[PDB]
Amino acid sequence: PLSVFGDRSTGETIRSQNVMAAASIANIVKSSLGPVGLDKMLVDDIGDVTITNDGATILKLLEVEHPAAKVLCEL
Amino acid sequence: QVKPYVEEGLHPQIIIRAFRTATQLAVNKIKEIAVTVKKADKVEQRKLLEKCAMTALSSKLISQQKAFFAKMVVDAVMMLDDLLQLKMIGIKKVQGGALEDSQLVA
Amino acid sequence: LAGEGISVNTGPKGVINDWRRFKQLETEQREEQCREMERLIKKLSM
Amino acid sequence: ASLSLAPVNIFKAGADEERAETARLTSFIGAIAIGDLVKSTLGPKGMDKILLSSGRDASLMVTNDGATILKNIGVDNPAAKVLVDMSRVQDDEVGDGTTSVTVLAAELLREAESLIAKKIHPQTIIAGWREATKAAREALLSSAVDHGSDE
Amino acid sequence: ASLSLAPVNIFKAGADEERAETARLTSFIGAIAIGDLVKSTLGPKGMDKILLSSGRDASLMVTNDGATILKNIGVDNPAAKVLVDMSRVQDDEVGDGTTSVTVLAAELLREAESLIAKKIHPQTIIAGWREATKAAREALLSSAVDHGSDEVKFRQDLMNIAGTTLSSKLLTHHKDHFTKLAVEAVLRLKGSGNLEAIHIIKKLGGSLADSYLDEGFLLDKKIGVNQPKRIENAKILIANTGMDTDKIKIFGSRVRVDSTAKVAEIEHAEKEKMKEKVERILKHGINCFINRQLIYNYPEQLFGAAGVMAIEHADFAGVERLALVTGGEIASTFDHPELVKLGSCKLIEEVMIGEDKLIHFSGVALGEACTIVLRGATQQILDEAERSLHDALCVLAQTVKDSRTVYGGGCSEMLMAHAVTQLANRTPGKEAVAMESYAKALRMLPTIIADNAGYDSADLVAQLRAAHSEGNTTAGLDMREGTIGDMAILGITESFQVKRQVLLSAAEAAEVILRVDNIIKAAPR
Amino acid sequence: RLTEYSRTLSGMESYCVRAFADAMEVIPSTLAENAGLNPISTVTELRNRHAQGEKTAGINVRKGGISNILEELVVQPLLVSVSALTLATETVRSILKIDDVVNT
Amino acid sequence: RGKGAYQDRDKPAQIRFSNISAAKAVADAIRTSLGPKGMDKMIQDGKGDVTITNDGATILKQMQVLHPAARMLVELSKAQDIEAGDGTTSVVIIAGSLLDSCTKLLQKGIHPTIISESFQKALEKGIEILTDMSRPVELSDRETLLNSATTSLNSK
Amino acid sequence: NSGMNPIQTMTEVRARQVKEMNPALGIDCLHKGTNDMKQQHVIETLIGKKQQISLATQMVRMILKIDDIRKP
Amino acid sequence: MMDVDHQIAKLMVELSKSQDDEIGDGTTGVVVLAGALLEEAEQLLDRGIHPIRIADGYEQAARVAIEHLDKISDSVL
Ligand SMILES: Nc1ncnc2c1ncn2[C@@H]1O[C@H](COP(=O)(O)OP(=O)(O)O)[C@@H](O)[C@H]1O
Ligand SMILES: Nc1ncnc2c1ncn2[C@@H]1O[C@H](COP(=O)(O)OP(=O)(O)O)[C@@H](O)[C@H]1O
Ligand SMILES: Nc1ncnc2c1ncn2[C@@H]1O[C@H](COP(=O)(O)OP(=O)(O)O)[C@@H](O)[C@H]1O
Ligand SMILES: [Mg+2]
Ligand SMILES: [Mg+2]
Ligand SMILES: [Mg+2]
Ligand SMILES: [Mg+2]
């Protein structure tokens, strides 16, 4: 009846999805906090290597699709 | 409820022991506070069975007719001898007719 | 057999979503084809 | 809200339904097509058809019988199926009239199409036609002449 | 032996050919389909259509105009193409009558199909139809009434004609207001026929009844940066000069020197030339300067310093309408100020219409150019209001040109048909049958009018037929409640030109389609 | 008020005006929803309060009930409700005057 | 006087029902974005652009609706945005509810022209009622203007 | 289906039923000039009507109780 | 004979078949009545009523209607 060319998620589904995305972005960098935190190594699928511990750098280098995850990245 | 504690690296054995202890205590409490009547009165036993059946049925599409079906179910069960075998309570489904049209055949 | 002027009218107003969804992939493959044809036979013909 | 013209789809793949306009249109087209096919083979000056079978043997058949013409055609229009069955039953009951009955039915349905276009409820048409059929049958019976006694 | 049904093949791939019966079948089917589609949008109770485009933009139109429905559809039946072109030419010649002419042609072709089924040569049908058209045209011409001399009666007839034209359209909700508006707009042209002098501005938002005819003119342009935004007793000068890097038209000219000082001198000379041109313009003693082309920053500055409202980039239509409304002369040279007439209006100011700003010319001098502001709730509503108003304005302009009027509501059609029947039952042969079919189509027109309203069309048309045969020549369909009434009293009036054009065009198209016995299609590209 | 007005009409016109009033009753129901309130009882209480004469009674989301809203400082300009009513009615009439769809 | 005119088409009724269904669906879509307790929606277009908004006009414009009735409602919301400035959700909800009522009205055998005239009469009466409910305001009273702005912002 | 106006005829018949206590007044579908189904000899079995109402109500309840669909 | 795929359409088909089996007449009245009941329930739900409450109200009204039917019944030989 609505007939919109796309996909619609309503209610608890989209909220849980946003929380999933934010939690995934958190867990990406959660292991790199505090003096006992450890650095991460990144590959740009061409051979470039970037060993880093900075959260902003890690989140900027990753390519992300979900919008809430993007919100946390730009945060 | 225990997900956050797992997330912060709590050993699963502690959680398992806590669940076992809580379950044992809860089951003991249920057995202690459960209500029973030591009279074995036929009228009261029939009423208790009917009330239990009504509570069991008061969530299905036949909840509007839960008194009728509860009475039928209690009668059917009490008509069983000593093992209460399920195969001695036949159930026949016939298309067409209201719910109240359904009957128990003695 | 008459009424050849059907004028399908309301038909493709309710079934528009499926037609557009399939046409999007058709045009995607068309753009891929238009990108790869000039690679093919264009110089191989000579 | 029509069965087919609703946002939810209630049919399998291949099923379809035709509402008032479309149903009447297809029925009238099929009936008129069958009637126009069988006619021109009517009366003393009628001509014959050729029925070319499409099978392996491809049997040939030139004929003037209305029932024979209507039987050996693949009609997909269901109203055409009704008229074909009517002609076949007419042949079964009596030998002749297999063309006349089909032509009469087609003409009646063409007039019915005109009447529907003139905003007349089909039930009114049916009632009028029942009365007309009663009157016509009575007149035809009254006009009958018998000669069985005289050898 | 036909071309297609011959043992050898004479055609390219994709080229086909349809002989007599098949060609007639396809032509009649297509024409009847077109007529059935366009009808049901006829008369005071006709409904609209939604024209959903299949293109990438997917334009949406909600219309009652027959010509717009017919032209904006993918048509592949050649006879349907004939009818579509007929409707378009009808729209070009006069405003209304598109749906009527299409429906009349369709009904004539349906009757012709029946007649050919009755074993009548199409040439006999054509001869009978020519006689019938002559009779109907003579009857309608004798039925016309002219009120051009009587001023008040002519204005009343104009109001009735506008109301009848707008009755079918969406503006029927505010028929009174819009009829008054359209009549005033046409009368403001003072006899000129150019409908381009009437500008219709569509502004989204606000009710449809909020539409109004401006007492002056409204321009959708912008004033300069340092220029006055409000001028009283304006002496407007309308021009079509360059005023933007105005280059001398000797296109082979170039600047060639040996020092940058000379280049600086030459650019100073160019700026001085522009300043002298602006001084010459100001020598006319003007308040507002309206230019067709752009105005660059230097002349804009010069006008601002002189306190002159310099409206820039008003297209040819803009300057033409301003000249019409204010009486100015569109000038391109300023060496003779005394030979150029200036426009004049009491006040120029900026107004808000919704969220936009428009220039308002109030208290204009001549006023032979109108601006109608259309307000609506949807873009489709605005477009349909514009189309309906265009129909009304076209018909009113035609009536002003030719003041002969005939009564609508089926009266004219049915008196035509009565004359056709009188001629038909007086001639021998099958031409009489063809003429009776002609009259039958003419009857079928108000029959469709009555069907669209849910009335008892058969009884109403029979009553009208009896009334016209008994001498009551002004009877017609009263659609207020569904009886027959006096079109003279009820004030349902039509332009004589519209009905005559409808009849003749429908007869011509039916004749040209009927003569066809073979449709040969080339291989499509 | 439109229900009361329709009670003074007759024929199909009265039914149509009653339907108009019932349709207007939807905004308070949507406001009662989205706030956790019981929409049916909340709308019923609003209607009763307005019938008793409190023209300013409205849905109070702060206290989770119905009370005078001028004390809640919830006001809006007239040319919002008036404009919405007029434009919605115009669009509904325009849609009603439609009986066919044609693809170009 | 007999049965009456036979409605032999039934396609106009189908078109009216389809238009009403589309409009009601659009309103139901924007029902949860109303009031101080409404919630925003995330719209992702054909490109990667992402919009979070409570504005009814923006929601309607940002998602292509593909149905003629829904497109007319989009233009309706745009027009209300132009003239009034806000209340763009309420106008769409009102139009959807009116057409939803038109469903049951048309099923009862009322021509969709008596419905239109009756709706016009009801609109005139409603405008009279709303004007009677009004309270005069002057711009020198900063308190009322502040309250109006705060009320407008309460839902964002 | 009989061509009469639905709402007008239904409202008139209901008002007549309320005014004069005759539960036999129905829709004169055959246009016999009277609404009295007892006089028109239109008769239906009580079991049929009771079954209609019962079955319709139970199936409507069963449909209303469904709030989830898991088609493959 | 209708070739339906929607499950609710199958439920309507089964309801009509049940009315046919038990009674043999009125197989069209049940379907129309069920459609009307659901149509009214739609606008009831739009106002925020739990569908179970709607079903309970329908059951209560059905009991009232059946009692009335028994009351206004007429006997035949
Ligand atoms: N010699 C004749 N003169 C006039 N009419 C005839 C003659 N022979 C047959 N007919 C008419 O032809 C009609 C159709 O007969 P026919 O062409 O055999 O087809 P069918 O009998 O199958 O309908 C009959 O109604 C009959 O009246
Ligand atoms: N108030 C009215 N009463 C009776 N007939 C009318 C009325 N208004 C218009 N008509 C008729 O409706 C017909 C169709 O007019 P309209 O649809 O406006 O333009 P077109 O002629 O292009 O279809 C006209 O021939 C006119 O005679
Ligand atoms: N604080 C509030 N308490 C109660 N109702 C409110 C409050 N603020 C706004 N509303 C109501 O919410 C309705 C919807 O406004 P809003 O959600 O901003 O969208 P729109 O203004 O576009 O309709 C308005 O009719 C208004 O009466
Ligand atoms: Mg024979
Ligand atoms: Mg016109
Ligand atoms: Mg707001
Ligand atoms: Mg029966």
In 3D, which of E269, E286, E287, E281 has the Cα closest to residue E243?
A: E281
Tokens of E186: 């046409």
- Measured in Å, residue E425 CA sits from the centre of ligand 5 at 33
Cα(I69)–Cα(I76) distance, integer angstroms: 15
Tokens of E211: 């539409």
Cα(E103)–Cα(E67) distance, integer angstroms: 12
Question: What angle (nearest 5°) sits at the alpha carbon of residue I35, between those of residues I29 and I39?
Answer: 145
Can you name the residues that pair with D52 across neighbouring β-strands?
D60
CB H13 within 8 A of CB H35: yes
Sort B29 into a burial class: Cβ within 10 Å, 0-12 / 13-18 / 19+.
exposed
Amino acid, single-letter form, for residue E426: R
Interface test with I, best of B63, B64, B94 (most I CBs within 10 A): B64
Which resolution in angstroms does this entry have? Answer: 3.0
Residue G5 DSSP one-character state: -
Please tell me the distance in Å from H25's CA to the nearest CA on chain B.
28
Cα separations in angstroms, F103 against C22, E42, E53, E54: 19, 20, 6, 7
* At least 3 CB pairs under 8 A between chains H and B: yes
Tokens 């707009």 correspond to what residue? E185
Which H or E run includes D10? Answer: none
Strand stretches in E134-196, DSSP E: 145-146
Sign (positive or negative) of CA dihedral F37, F38, F40, F42:
negative
Please tell me the distance in Å from E122's CA to the nearest CA on chain D.
21
CB E49 within 8 A of CB F100: yes
In 3D, which of E388, E477, E432 has the Cα closest to residue E165?
A: E388
Output b/e per residue, F72-90; b: 16+ Cβ within 10 A. bebeebeebbbbbbbbbbb
Q: Which residues, 6 or more positions from B27, have their beta carbon under 8 angstroms from its beta carbon?
A: none
Tokens 């003629």 correspond to what residue? G68
Going by their DSSP bridges, the two strands E356-364 and E217-219 should be labelled as antiparallel
Sort G14 into a burial class: Cβ within 10 Å, 0-12 / 13-18 / 19+.
buried
CB A63 within 8 A of CB A43: no
Going by their DSSP bridges, the two strands E404-407 and E493-495 should be labelled as antiparallel
Cα(E311)–Cα(E318) distance, integer angstroms: 11
Output b/e per residue, E299-336; b: 16+ Cβ within 10 A. bbbbbbebebbbbbebeeebbbbbbbbbbbebbeebee
Question: What angle (nearest 5°) sits at the alpha carbon of residue E203, between those of residues E198 and E207?
Answer: 105
Cα(E396)–Cα(E391) distance, integer angstroms: 9
Cα(F2)–Cα(E146) distance, integer angstroms: 49
* Interface residues from chain B to H (CB-CB < 8 Å): 61, 64, 96-100
CB E228 within 8 A of CB E307: yes
Helix/strand/coil for E353: strand
I5 touches chain D (CB under 8 A): yes
Tokens of H19: 């005014």
Sign (positive or negative) of CA dihedral E496, E500, E505, E510:
positive
Question: What angle (nearest 5°) sits at the alpha carbon of residue E223, between those of residues E221 and E228?
Answer: 145
Can you name the residues that pair with E353 across neighbouring β-strands?
E356
Sort E281 into a burial class: Cβ within 10 Å, 0-12 / 13-18 / 19+.
buried
CB E281 within 8 A of CB E334: yes
In 3D, which of E293, E208, E199, E179 has the Cα closest to residue E244?
A: E293
CA dihedral E189, E321, E287, E301 (to 10 degrees): 170
CB A7 within 8 A of CB A55: no
Nearest-atom index, ligand 3, CA of G33: 17
Cα(D40)–Cα(E296) distance, integer angstroms: 83
Cα(G10)–Cα(I23) distance, integer angstroms: 33
**Are B97 and H51 in contact (CB < 8 Å)?**
yes
* At least 3 CB pairs under 8 A between chains A and G: yes
Residue whose CA is at the smallest distance from ligand 1 atom 11: D43
Cα(E170)–Cα(F95) distance, integer angstroms: 11
Cα(G47)–Cα(D97) distance, integer angstroms: 71
Please tell me the distance in Å from A36's CA to the nearest CA on chain C.
50
Tokens 């009896």 correspond to what residue? E466
CB E435 within 8 A of CB E406: no
CB E90 within 8 A of CB E67: yes
F72: left (phi over 0), alpha (psi -120 to 50) or beta: alpha
Q: How many residues does chain G have?
A: 156
Question: In H1-72, which ranges are continuous DSSP H helix?
Answer: 6-19, 37-40, 46-64
Q: How many CB atoms lie within 10 A of CB E252?
A: 4
Interface test with A, best of C17, C21, C27 (most A CBs within 10 A): C17
Tokens of E347: 């006040």
Sort I64 into a burial class: Cβ within 10 Å, 0-12 / 13-18 / 19+.
exposed
Which H or E run includes C34? Answer: helix C16-36
CB D90 within 8 A of CB D67: yes
Please tell me the distance in Å from F9's CA to the nearest CA on chain I.
25
Helix/strand/coil for D151: coil
CB F98 within 8 A of CB G113: no
SS (H, E, C) chain B: CCHHHHHCCCCHHHHHHHHHHHHHHHHHHHHHHCCCCCCCCHHHHHHHHHHHHHHHHCCCCCHHHHHHHHHHHHHHHHCCCCCCCHHHCCCCCCCCCCHHHCCCCC
Helix/strand/coil for E63: strand
Output b/e per residue, A6-23; b: 16+ Cβ within 10 A. eeeeeeeeeeeebeebbe
CB G65 within 8 A of CB G72: no
Residue E171 DSSP one-character state: G
Q: Which experimental approach was used here?
A: cryo-EM
List subunits contacting chain H, requiring 3 or more Cβ pairs under 8 Å.
B, F, G, I
CB F66 within 8 A of CB F57: yes
Q: How many CB atoms lie within 10 A of CB C42?
A: 9
Cα(D96)–Cα(D101) distance, integer angstroms: 10
Sort G8 into a burial class: Cβ within 10 Å, 0-12 / 13-18 / 19+.
middle
Half-sphere exposure of E310 (CA within 13 A, CB side): 26
Q: How many CB atoms lie within 10 A of CB F42?
A: 21
Cα separations in angstroms, C21 against F102, G68, G70: 22, 19, 19
Residues in chain C closer than 8 A to F101 (CB atoms): 9-10, 13
Please tell me the distance in Å from F11's CA to the nearest CA on chain H.
8
List subunits contacting chain I, requiring 3 or more Cβ pairs under 8 Å.
B, D, F, H
Number of H helices, E strands in chain C: 2, 0
Q: What share of chain I is helix, strand, coil (3-state, %, to 5)?
A: 75, 0, 25
Residues in chain I closer than 8 A to H47 (CB atoms): 23
Cα(E254)–Cα(E426) distance, integer angstroms: 86
Helix/strand/coil for D150: coil
Cα separations in angstroms, E170 against E216, E478, F85: 26, 20, 19
Q: How many CB atoms lie within 10 A of CB E16?
A: 12
> First CA to last CA across chain F, in angstroms?
45
**Are A3 and C20 in contact (CB < 8 Å)?**
no
Cα(B21)–Cα(H45) distance, integer angstroms: 66
Can you name the residues that pair with E331 across neighbouring β-strands?
E239
**Are E51 and F102 in contact (CB < 8 Å)?**
yes
**Are C10 and G67 in contact (CB < 8 Å)?**
no
CB E498 within 8 A of CB E398: yes
G1 touches chain H (CB under 8 A): no
**Are H3 and G108 in contact (CB < 8 Å)?**
no
Output b/e per residue, I23-32; b: 16+ Cβ within 10 A. beebbebbbe
Chain H residue with minimum CA distance to I56: H61
- Measured in Å, residue D96 CA sits from the centre of ligand 4 at 5
Output b/e per residue, E406-426; b: 16+ Cβ within 10 A. bbbbbbbbbbbbbbbbebbee
CB E421 within 8 A of CB E434: no
Cα separations in angstroms, E140 against D55, E192, E502: 64, 27, 12
**Sequence-separated contacts (24+) of E16-22 with Cβ below 8 Å:** E16/E520, E16/E521, E17/E518, E17/E519, E17/E520, E17/E521, E18/E518, E18/E519, E18/E520, E19/E517, E19/E518, E20/E517, E20/E518, E22/E519
Sort H13 into a burial class: Cβ within 10 Å, 0-12 / 13-18 / 19+.
middle
Cα(E98)–Cα(E66) distance, integer angstroms: 5
Tokens of E373: 């502001």
Cα(F97)–Cα(G99) distance, integer angstroms: 12
Question: What angle (nearest 5°) sits at the alpha carbon of residue H39, between those of residues H33 and H45?
Answer: 120
List subunits contacting chain C, requiring 3 or more Cβ pairs under 8 Å.
A, D, E, F, G
Cα(H18)–Cα(H12) distance, integer angstroms: 10
I48 is in an annotated binding site: no
Can you name the residues that pair with G43 across neighbouring β-strands?
G51
Tokens 């369709």 correspond to what residue? E106
Cα(G133)–Cα(G127) distance, integer angstroms: 10
Question: What angle (nearest 5°) sits at the alpha carbon of residue E53, between those of residues E52 and E56?
Answer: 130
Tokens of B72: 């039928």
**Are G6 and H3 in contact (CB < 8 Å)?**
yes
Q: Which residues, 6 or more positions from F38, have their beta carbon under 8 angstroms from its beta carbon?
A: F32, I48
In 3D, which of E21, E26, E22 has the Cα closest to residue E82?
A: E26
Interface test with G, best of F34, F89, F95, F97 (most G CBs within 10 A): F95
A2 touches chain C (CB under 8 A): no
Helix/strand/coil for G33: coil
In 3D, which of E235, E231, E242, E330 has the Cα closest to residue E282?
A: E235
* Interface residues from chain H to B (CB-CB < 8 Å): 50-51, 54-55, 58, 61-62, 65
SS (H, E, C) E271-314: HHHHHHHHHHHHCCCCCEEEECCCCCHHHHHHHHHCCCEEECCC
Which H or E run includes E49? Answer: strand E48-52
In 3D, which of E427, E477, E468, E426 has the Cα closest to residue E450?
A: E477
Amino acid, single-letter form, for residue E245: T
CB E82 within 8 A of CB E401: no
Can you name the residues that pair with D61 across neighbouring β-strands?
D51
Q: How many CB atoms lie within 10 A of CB E260?
A: 8
Phi, psi of G93 (to 5 degrees): -65, -40
Q: How many residues does chain C have?
A: 46
Q: Which residues, 6 or more positions from D59, have their beta carbon under 8 angstroms from its beta carbon?
A: D53
CB A42 within 8 A of CB A36: no
Cα(E465)–Cα(E461) distance, integer angstroms: 6
Q: Which residues, 6 or more positions from A4, have their beta carbon under 8 angstroms from its beta carbon?
A: G63, G64, G65, G66
In 3D, which of E473, E446, E439 has the Cα closest to residue E460?
A: E446
- Measured in Å, residue D97 CA sits from the centre of ligand 1 at 8
Cα(D85)–Cα(D101) distance, integer angstroms: 11
Which H or E run includes E2? Answer: none
